[PDB]
Structures are given as structure tokens and as C-alpha cells.
Amino acid sequence: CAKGCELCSEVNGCLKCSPKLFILLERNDIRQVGVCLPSCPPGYFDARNPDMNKCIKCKIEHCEACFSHNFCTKCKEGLYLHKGRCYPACPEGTMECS
């Protein structure tokens, strides 16, 4: 059974991670396998939950790193960052529109 993973398969890889870790479903290519990591990678944010902590894909337009699904923390170079979203033109006020 894998590094910080406490439940396994050959087919599905990891099924439950250690307490404070996050589960990522890594696809490659036909395969989709469970992996447990301490922080989530770049596409993603950490999303702690009582039953299962989960890496969640940061979906939002031109964002490289978010806090939550809705709220960007770092926009791509060189967009303007205002109230967690990403714009070309900075309404009302180093590339962090405020």
C-alpha cells in the first residue's frame, strides 16, 4: 500500500488517505488512480472535509492558484487581480488590481 495511503487496489490505487492528507485522482491515460499527497498540485486547491480531504481543480479563467473554486489567489502573467477574479483591465486600483 502506497506512501501515505491506508487503503489500496491494483486497479484503483488509493482509496483512503491518512488523516490530514489529500486524495488526488491521477489520470494517465486509460488509468485513473488514487494518490495521496500532503498539499495539492498547481491545477488545484486543498479542500479539507471531515470524511475525505480532496484536491479540487481550480477552474477559474486565467487563474494559476486559487483559495477556493471561486477565488483566485494568483492570476497568470500579466492579468490584474481584483477580489479573487482575473481581469485584463483593473477596475479601481506589482499586478494585483486594488
Partner: protein, 149 residues
């Protein structure tokens, strides 16, 4: 009633004769029409409200290897709900390997009439499909869910 299942690897074989053929059952949740598509394995946790859609090109056939429903966490959705999701998300057919969760059959029983077919498959055949899909490999394949006989 029953389901024939062709498994054609995308590797040249005029000799690799009708490469793999397997058998399975049709659910009842579904409709019993045939289908065709690339083979994609997805983790049972993927079919969870509402994990990230991988956004595959619609028309692939997903294989889901169920796990012991006793050792494994309380599931995020009913198995019916999961079967629905997989299709809403692109899948031309849904294949459930139920070796480890035999009782799935009686859960995927009551009809809610799904345009996409779902096909249950146990011990003998399933074991070979995973022989295929497992590392050795994510070997590209093409599946025909050839309707009954």
C-alpha cells in the same frame, strides 16, 4: 438479457484473432441498446457529486472496478446515480466490474431508463479485462458492446 463484449487493442493484429471476447449482463437501470467506444477506466470516487469532470471526448466506454463495500468508505452516491453521472459526463457505455461487490447487481436493478447502457461483469471475464487495463498496461483499446445473441 446478456452482453457480448469485444476488446480490440489499437495494436496491429490480423493474427491476434478477434482478440478478446467476454460476456456480461445488462443492468435494468439502463436500456439494453449496444454501444462502441474507447476503453477508459475511472476510479469509483470520480463518479462523486460533483468531482472534476475530466472532459473526455464523449463516446468512450468507462470501466469501473468496484471495491469491497465493507472495507471501503461510505459511497458518495448510489450506484445508480453513479451510472447516470458517468453517462451525463460522456460515456457511451458504463462497465461495472463487480467481483468485489457482488451486491451491486441488486442495486443496479430498479429501472430509471438510461439512454446509455450499463453492463455488469464478474470473476472470469472481468479478471482478464483488468489483466488488460492494469499497468501492462494503459493499453489503448476499442470496445464493442455487441448487444445480445
Amino acid at each position: 438479457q446478456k452482453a457480448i463484449i469485444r476488446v480490440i487493442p489499437l495494436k496491429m493484429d490480423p493474427t491476434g484473432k478477434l482478440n478478446l471476447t467476454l460476456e456480461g449482463v445488462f443492468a435494468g437501470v439502463a436500456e439494453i441498446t449496444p454501444a462502441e467506444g474507447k476503453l477508459m477506466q475511472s476510479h469509483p470516487l470520480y463518479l462523486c457529486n460533483a468531482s472534476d469532470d475530466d472532459n473526455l471526448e464523449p463516446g468512450f466506454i468507462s470501466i469501473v472496478k468496484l471495491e469491497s463495500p465493507r472495507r471501503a468508505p461510505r459511497p458518495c452516491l448510489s450506484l445508480a446515480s453513479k451510472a447516470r453521472m458517468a453517462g451525463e459526463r460522456g460515456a457511451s457505455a458504463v462497465l461495472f466490474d463487480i467481483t468485489e461487490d457482488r451486491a451491486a447487481a441488486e442495486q443496479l436493478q430498479q429501472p430509471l431508463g438510461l439512454t446509455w447502457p450499463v453492463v455488469l461483469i464478474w470473476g472470469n471475464d472481468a479478471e482478464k479485462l483488468m489483466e488488460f487495463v492494469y499497468k501492462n498496461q494503459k493499453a489503448h483499446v476499442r470496445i464493442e458492446l455487441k448487444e445480445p445473441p
